[PDB]
Amino acid sequence: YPSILHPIDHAFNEYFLQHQLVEPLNNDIIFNYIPERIRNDVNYILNMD
Amino acid sequence: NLEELMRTGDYAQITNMLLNNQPVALVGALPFITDSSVISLVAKLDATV
Amino acid sequence: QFDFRASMHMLTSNLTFTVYSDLLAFVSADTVEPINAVAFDNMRIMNEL
User: Which family does it belong to (chain C) (predicted)?
Assistant: First the structure.
């Protein structure tokens, strides 16, 4: 989008745009988020439905 | 073995085999429906369960 | 002084996404019957039955 900004304002907004904290989320990331020893415990059945 | 499957609750193998149409034999005391309809057999209903 | 050339920028971002917080809400977690729960050595936790 076009914007009008003072160079300092542009610096701040460009930093915000270029350094966002959101990462792509997929089922592999969620699966690895589970503790590794609970994923290996046969007493717990974990599924991605 | 259906008993082992029910005891462990891990359905990964049976799910993968059913989704991949891999011939298998599910072994265990099972109730069954008796169907005398020829049209049902032609409709291939036994494969839908 | 305000300069249009020095203030006009193009701000770039993503069109849309959804941010999620509770990753473990995406995991369907079940447990075996406690009678059948086993320990690290693959034997039942309580064997006196």
Answer: Belongs to the rotavirus VP2 family.
Local structure of residue B45 (DSSP, 8 states): G
Distance CA B2, CA B14 (A): 10
Q: Which two tokens stand for residue A26?
A: 């997929």
- For residue B8, the chain C residue with the least C-alpha distance is C32
Question: What amino acid is encoded at C12 in this protein?
Answer: T
Nearest to C26 by CA among A16, A30, A41: A30
Instruction: Pick from A41, A44, A47 the residue to mutate for testing the B interface (most B CBs within 10 Å).
Output: A47
Q: What is the separation of C-alpha C29 from the centre of its chain, rounded to a whole number of angstroms? A: 13
Contacts with B10 from chain A: Cβ below 8 Å: 42, 45
Alpha helices, DSSP H, located in chain C: 4-7
What is the rounded distance in angstroms from the CA atom of residue C45 to the CA atom of residue C34?
9
CA angle C29, C32, C34 (to 5 degrees): 125
Q: Give the side-chain half-sphere CA count within 13 A for B13.
A: 12
Resolution (A): 2.7
Tell me the three state secondary structure of residue B46: helix
